[PDB]
Design a protein around this nucleic acid. Structure first.
Lengths: 51, 146, 64
RNA sequence: UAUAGUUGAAGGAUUUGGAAAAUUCCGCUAAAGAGGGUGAAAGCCCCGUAGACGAAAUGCUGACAACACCUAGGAGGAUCCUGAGUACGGCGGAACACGAGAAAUUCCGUCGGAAUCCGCGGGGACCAUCCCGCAAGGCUAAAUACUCCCUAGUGACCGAUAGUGAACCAGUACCGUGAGGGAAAGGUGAAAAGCACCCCGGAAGGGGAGUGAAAUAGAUCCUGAAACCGUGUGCCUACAACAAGUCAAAGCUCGUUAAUGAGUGAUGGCGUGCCUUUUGUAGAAUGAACCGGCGAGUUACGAUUGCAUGCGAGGUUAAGUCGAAGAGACGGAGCCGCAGCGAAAGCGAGUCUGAAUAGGGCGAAUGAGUAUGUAGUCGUAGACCCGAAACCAUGUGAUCUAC
RNA sequence: GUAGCGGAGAAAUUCCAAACGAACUUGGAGAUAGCUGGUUCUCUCCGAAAUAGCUUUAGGGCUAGCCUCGGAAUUGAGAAU
RNA sequence: GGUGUAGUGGUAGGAGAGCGUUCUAAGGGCGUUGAAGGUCGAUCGUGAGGACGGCUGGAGCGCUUAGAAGUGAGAAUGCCG
RNA sequence: GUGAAAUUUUAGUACCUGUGAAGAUGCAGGUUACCCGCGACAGGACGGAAAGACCCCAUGGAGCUUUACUGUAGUUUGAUA
């Protein structure tokens, strides 16, 4: 979502994992991954900007 | 779509033609230029419109007219476009804009009668042709040059 | 850079509604005692540009 | 804050090797899986990295203090002030996109030469009226241009004929009186363990013996192609006129990615290289000694057509702001299309010519566009590559030769 | 001592560093050349011209004619007897 | 897919469809039990071209799909060796 | 004993009469001829060396002439400071 900084730190450095915030998703980020793990808050925030 | 199986749409990308790469391709050895002459040289050719030495066509013809410095051009809208408003609306240059019908109203709007209205408008604009005003007033509305 | 239009052609020609080019006529400034009244009556009407001339002229008038 | 630094998590056995970081088992660590080194390819071996900490001294940038400077209203309209050889004009030149033009505006040389608020200049010759300003005195941050140099990095940029002229002691050797011109030349091995001792030989060089995983890795040292020069052999050849092969074929010699096998070949038929330029070439027309490397339609910005995708009587944003040199939203100034005709005034599904409502010209009558990608052609740029004789502008030469 | 838009010449277009009807070097500069040379892989389908007119034009160019690719259109418009 | 009928010389030149080189991304692989490169063979495809095996060699390299190009050499009285 | 050069498409490189871009070692029909060298001569290889200096062209240059065009340094004559 947002200043969820402890989670982004914990998820760095894992060689299968990429981390993006909900105001900064590109087309190339979603196509390259096999799955998306999004939180409930971030999902509504994406629905707010793609409208 | 996966990044290891991309495919453009058919007919959308073409390859390229490379001249001077052997005889069997079709364009080796002079690369489509024929034999000798001014057109076979690098940077060869004559300027656009040149004709050898015959008098070029622009130079046998006479000049004509002048530009007026106070010229007025308007931004016509005919009569069908006034059918996308409700019966009774007072159409105007700001309601025409903000529907995008007219952007860039050059020297003001001018209404033209081509060809059929059925509404109850009250049109405000800068000019009216004789039949535009007429058909506007038959259908039952009013005009005002302003 | 941008393409430049031929300024001598633009002073002599205009573009009609279906894409053509209206033009004036030659032999219309000078010795009219050498030509017949029917000639000078019929050299007063405008005409258009031919296809050989247009093919070679098209790019110089692209913008006006 | 710049200029030194400090600390910084987590692995052992097994197989193949000279040597593991590789393979197979079983573990651990991460706010650190960026990168470099180590006898081959390492998150966990070394240097680092993420994170936390630090400056005696000198230099920079803020903030707040002092000290220095600068800055007031209302009324009156008797009189005084407000940039002079100046503005401006004739003559000659130039600058304005504007080539004297109908030539306003701004400069330079030369001559002539104002007015003072009842004034003076401008609105593209000139005049009248209205409107906007107040020359002939001085200074001023930022938003814009550039990189010899220092720090930290980046690249669908080069990899020793490339990339700087220069990866190496290069503006060097070398060439010229001089100004000036100007190169060639990287690689043993993990570690020098770089061959003790013996034999032939003046030496060079070589043969053993040793080092080493390997010396046919021995310093002309990784790999080691072709031209070119040799040694050994299976088959042919001393009565034969040969662009040198191709088709037919006995004898001899072999035995393969195993199939209608491979090498050589006496003898017989047929047969005037390759490239360029030409009406036309074996040409006694043109080029090439041979082998290897290098060596020629590209990009930027515009214009047009075909194909493709998204929207559709509509389509689309530019500069710029935040953002990782990115995507990823704001931004509607502007551009194209949706209506034409006419030199223009103008009129408008019609309009111009015309006395004409006549005729005719060009238009309408459902009649599709716009942004972006891609390819074909064209324009401006050296514009597919190489090649003159010449022209101009700075400089260096009378150590040769002429007076 | 005299230097290249120049010098010097008992005069020859003679000399000015083995080259002088106008020295040498660097720059404008990748000067210009309607001329000459060269231009690098493959297969499938089609397939010309060497003519007319105008040209300070004649070994260059332009428009038409003759080749190739994509579309549209009523036909029974093309050819041979 | 069957079957018929018709066609398939070609310079300038137009149109179509492919082979090979280097680099980027994503995926799935190989390698000291020996990669690239070099050399030999009597192998495969309609062409450019593709494999497999021996010997040499000592550390990197293929394949698929898409992208980008300093992308192919026998000739210039070419340039260097 | 030492040790170059210009040249060079590859060469197992005869003669006569013809043919042919119209004068052939190489093409046709004949005639002649065992293999490999050394010392000598210059008939041929349109022999080698020098992208004809002769001739014409490039809407190429450069030096020179003049009552060819357009300018100008210098000299002179008037007005004005």
């Amino acid at each position: 979502e947002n200043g969820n900084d402890f989670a982004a730190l914990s998820a760095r450095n894992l060689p299968n994992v990429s981390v993006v915030t909900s105001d900064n998703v590109s087309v190339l980020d979603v196509v390259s991954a096999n799955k998306v793990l999004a939180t409930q808050t971030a999902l509504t925030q994406i629905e707010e900007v793609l409208a | 779509m996966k990044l290891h199986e991309l495919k453009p749409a058919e007919g959308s990308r073409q390859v390229r033609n490379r001249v001077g790469r052997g005889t069997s391709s079709g364009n080796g050895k002079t690369a489509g230029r024929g034999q000798k002459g001014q057109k076979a040289r690098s940077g060869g050719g004559v300027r656009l419109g040149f004709e050898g030495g015959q008098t070029p066509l622009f130079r046998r013809l006479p000049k004509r007219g002048f530009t007026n410095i106070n010229r007025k051009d308007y931004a016509v809208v005919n009569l069908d476009t006034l059918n996308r408003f409700e019966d009774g609306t007072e159409v105007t240059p700001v309601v025409l804009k903000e529907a995008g019908i007219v952007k860039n109203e050059k020297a003001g709007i001018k209404v033209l009668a081509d060809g059929e209205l059925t509404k109850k408008l009250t049109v405000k604009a800068a000019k009216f042709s004789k039949s535009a005003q007429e058909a506007i007033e038959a259908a039952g509305g009013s005009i005002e040059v302003i | 850079p941008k393409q430049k239009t031929h300024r001598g052609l633009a002073k002599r020609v205009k573009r009609t509604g279906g894409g053509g080019l209206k033009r004036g006529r030659a032999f219309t400034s000078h010795r009219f005692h050498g030509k017949t009244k029917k000639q000078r009556r019929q050299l007063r009407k405008a005409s258009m540009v031919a296809k050989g001339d247009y093919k070679r002229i098209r790019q110089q008038l692209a913008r006006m």
